[PDB]
């Protein structure tokens, strides 16, 4: 248990805990993280039968900022950036766990790249005829948004009347769960239900009803290009997608009562070179202008202490089965081949 | 896909450097290529091919 | 700044590398100004860069700034492996240099692409032969 | 005194094509654009078609200047492969050697 | 070969060079002094001094390679080793304490023992006698036994019976069966042994 | 237009517009009625922020320009 910490409350993590793995309970894993966790990290949780996250400085720095958030001031945009596989997604997840345990309302977009590529059913929106709806993507998110924020969905009550069809319409004063249920049940109305959820939460957080975290991973997708094409194969712009149009509005700092934490990702990005990782390189001019002013937070490769704790956590779980891996010579080869990159180390240790 | 400023600057540069000024499609641009080179029949390699 | 370093060259197929090996370092390799794991995403290529330093038990003890041009991904890793091994010979014992030479770490690989001949399909591949 | 009647026919074609090149270029330019009226472009189509057949440059053939061979000619020397090799193998072409590598 | 016959093969063993001089025999000492005067070939890009280097897995990877695509072949290999390890960890977690002792979780151990279980002890050579070809039982050299085990495993995984099953899934499943002395590849070995025993009376047809 | 400009000018840019709006909301949250454009945009902190943004927009983006931009924004937003 040299690599482990007994403090499992994300609100009590400090610099003494750097490098140590804290356990996320199975209940929190089902509730807080129905989505968002890296695909390969989810494999580890299944294989090890436990979810343990290393307390690192990027999350510690962002947790410190979120503990001192002035809820009166406009929401501050925090952008996690860093090279491929340094741990931007899992740093964001550690922060989502903190706010989730403090009864914040969580708006977790696990990967915004999925909304701008590989869409089978791109339907024209009824609310606005120049925009496109993404029924499958919207319904998928709504189901998970319901799971995370089931406690609050009854308390929050819509402040307008929303016309779904000629026959159906949500009335003022009903719980927001009804809007979420409509989108889930009727998938043709899912995109508009997402827009309404976003519209209501932004308005009602400023009124001081709840604290709202906007956690968007892969945020560079919002102001880039798309691989979605029209009937005539003309390229579609991200602004034309209604689902993206509504998320962009959440990114502006014209509301208060919460924070906006985002993470960049070149993985899954469109029309970006492999080694692009800096904010302006990935966001572009339009993306940088939308977020400016924002607080960049660097995520780097493991430091010597962090690297040793990761090897010890794998050794404690018996994941390293090669007889030379526990030795000092094996550890030096592990460090060189990964260069302490968390993602490269995990992938090489997966078959060793 | 050009701004008015960019379009008008390109038209000024084209006038300065002696290039086509009016908007011309690729088909009609062949007239420029035809009169900028010698016809193949007029080249010394062609008509003086044989001793 | 007074830091001791050695410089050597390495050639593999059409790739040509120039390596500067510093006597003391942390194990940082820069290839054309880029971190080696970013320059060589393929694992096999990074294993070739480890072989010279691992063979003499000096992983994490030197810094390397190398420049490589020409060839493909694997040839460039081979050219750098040779340039690094030759320059690293300045900071090891004579006996260790002989072990490096007997492990094939200091020989220029002469295997280069053979030319295609006329009347054949490839360098060796012949056209289909028809007895009748 | 040309190598054969075929070479002689190509000599006449190269001469006629040279004489008509300017007229053909001028008329062809009228046809190779979308600016001028189609009525005018149709009259130009007839005019270039009424010119003698041997003024058409596509009818010229690059024959070997020594033997009149219509194929296997190297354009830089205007010689057939057989004639070129005969001169090359005797060391009579400056700087041309057998290639080995 | 672009190497002259004088060039010798590189020896890549860290421990061999570090051996104390006193332990060296007189013949071993001569071999080391002679090598100092001999030309050596450049080490190939495959094998290195890494402690994780496994020659058998490297050979198996090359036999899987198609059209020189070693990256893809290596990707399939590491995915297979990971798949085997994950399956054994799941089996280990769901087993009782007594059963857990007998469950192997080292993928390399499973890979080596699965291939050893598929190695045929006897072979068949076609011998033409009196215009008739006879399958004659013959002893197989060690290299051929090991090569046949790998070829049978790869051929079985490439068979069209497996529908839209990715190679790492197919290979990991087959390796685990062979590790337990089951599956079609083990059956192929048994068929060869049974065919050779049936033709035992033809063994005299062999002249070596 | 600004797209035609080959040199980024911070004046009349989105950065100046966005930082001005953010600072005005911050003043309103404190219940301060000092909303003078000139004063807000004349502070030394704004000069550091202007310098950082211009470097990022006109020069090669690196880890040191991003860190300088971070510290300038943290001061203007009262994030410590
Ligand atoms: N805090 C951490 N605790 C445990 N493992 C971690 C941590 N950070 C990173 N890792 C390991 O590194 C891998 C990569 O992490 P993550 O997906 O967060 O990286 P990323 O920087 O977001 O990647 P990308 O650039 O591809 O989006 C994880 O799957 C995990 O194995
Ligand atoms: N079906 C439906 N969707 C609505 C209605 N009002 C809002 N929405 C959705 O919620 C989003 C946010 O609302 P609004 O701010 O009015 O959007 P805007 O008109 O695009 O600026 C819209 O883009 C729609 O997708 C409504 O009455 N019916
Ligand atoms: Mg990520
Ligand atoms: Mg071939
Ligand atoms: Mg012709």
mmCIF file of C-alpha atoms and ligand atoms in Angstrom, chain A residues 125-128 131 133 160-165 170 188-200 203 242-243 245-246 249, ligand 2:
data_model
loop_
_atom_site.group_PDB
_atom_site.id
_atom_site.type_symbol
_atom_site.label_atom_id
_atom_site.label_comp_id
_atom_site.label_asym_id
_atom_site.label_seq_id
_atom_site.Cartn_x
_atom_site.Cartn_y
_atom_site.Cartn_z
ATOM 1 C CA UNK A 125 -33.900 20.451 -36.920
ATOM 2 C CA UNK A 126 -37.538 21.498 -36.612
ATOM 3 C CA UNK A 127 -36.899 24.338 -34.150
ATOM 4 C CA UNK A 128 -34.467 25.932 -36.623
ATOM 5 C CA UNK A 131 -29.493 23.544 -38.206
ATOM 6 C CA UNK A 133 -30.185 17.504 -35.130
ATOM 7 C CA UNK A 160 -41.008 28.209 -19.597
ATOM 8 C CA UNK A 161 -43.394 26.183 -21.748
ATOM 9 C CA UNK A 162 -41.795 24.048 -24.467
ATOM 10 C CA UNK A 163 -43.798 22.825 -27.465
ATOM 11 C CA UNK A 164 -42.608 19.357 -28.492
ATOM 12 C CA UNK A 165 -45.275 18.501 -31.084
ATOM 13 C CA UNK A 170 -43.975 20.612 -21.405
ATOM 14 C CA UNK A 188 -36.513 12.780 -32.382
ATOM 15 C CA UNK A 189 -36.862 15.392 -29.611
ATOM 16 C CA UNK A 190 -33.555 14.521 -27.922
ATOM 17 C CA UNK A 191 -31.482 17.293 -29.506
ATOM 18 C CA UNK A 192 -34.015 19.933 -28.458
ATOM 19 C CA UNK A 193 -34.256 18.405 -24.979
ATOM 20 C CA UNK A 194 -30.487 18.800 -24.615
ATOM 21 C CA UNK A 195 -30.751 22.426 -25.711
ATOM 22 C CA UNK A 196 -33.473 23.072 -23.142
ATOM 23 C CA UNK A 197 -31.534 21.339 -20.360
ATOM 24 C CA UNK A 198 -28.527 23.526 -21.152
ATOM 25 C CA UNK A 199 -30.695 26.647 -21.395
ATOM 26 C CA UNK A 200 -32.397 25.969 -18.058
ATOM 27 C CA UNK A 203 -30.262 30.421 -16.222
ATOM 28 C CA UNK A 242 -27.725 22.410 -33.187
ATOM 29 C CA UNK A 243 -26.138 20.244 -30.497
ATOM 30 C CA UNK A 245 -24.478 25.460 -31.182
ATOM 31 C CA UNK A 246 -26.035 24.965 -27.743
ATOM 32 C CA UNK A 249 -23.226 28.976 -25.348
HETATM 33 N N1 LIG G 2 -38.694 21.801 -29.362
HETATM 34 C C1 LIG G 2 -38.339 22.930 -28.745
HETATM 35 N N2 LIG G 2 -37.052 23.176 -28.512
HETATM 36 C C2 LIG G 2 -36.857 24.350 -27.884
HETATM 37 C C3 LIG G 2 -37.802 25.270 -27.481
HETATM 38 N N3 LIG G 2 -37.195 26.353 -26.867
HETATM 39 C C4 LIG G 2 -35.914 26.073 -26.909
HETATM 40 N N4 LIG G 2 -35.640 24.874 -27.515
HETATM 41 C C5 LIG G 2 -34.317 24.266 -27.732
HETATM 42 O O1 LIG G 2 -33.419 24.786 -26.766
HETATM 43 C C6 LIG G 2 -32.345 25.503 -27.411
HETATM 44 C C7 LIG G 2 -31.993 26.719 -26.591
HETATM 45 O O2 LIG G 2 -33.034 27.707 -26.733
HETATM 46 P P1 LIG G 2 -32.838 29.188 -27.301
HETATM 47 O O3 LIG G 2 -31.889 29.906 -26.424
HETATM 48 O O4 LIG G 2 -34.173 29.772 -27.549
HETATM 49 O O5 LIG G 2 -32.135 28.894 -28.697
HETATM 50 P P2 LIG G 2 -31.880 29.790 -29.993
HETATM 51 O O6 LIG G 2 -33.247 30.237 -30.451
HETATM 52 O O7 LIG G 2 -31.192 28.888 -30.989
HETATM 53 O O8 LIG G 2 -31.008 30.934 -29.538
HETATM 54 C C8 LIG G 2 -32.841 25.785 -28.825
HETATM 55 O O9 LIG G 2 -31.751 25.883 -29.737
HETATM 56 C C9 LIG G 2 -33.729 24.572 -29.114
HETATM 57 O O10 LIG G 2 -32.972 23.458 -29.579
HETATM 58 C C10 LIG G 2 -39.175 24.992 -27.739
HETATM 59 O O11 LIG G 2 -40.145 25.692 -27.454
HETATM 60 N N5 LIG G 2 -39.347 23.784 -28.384
#
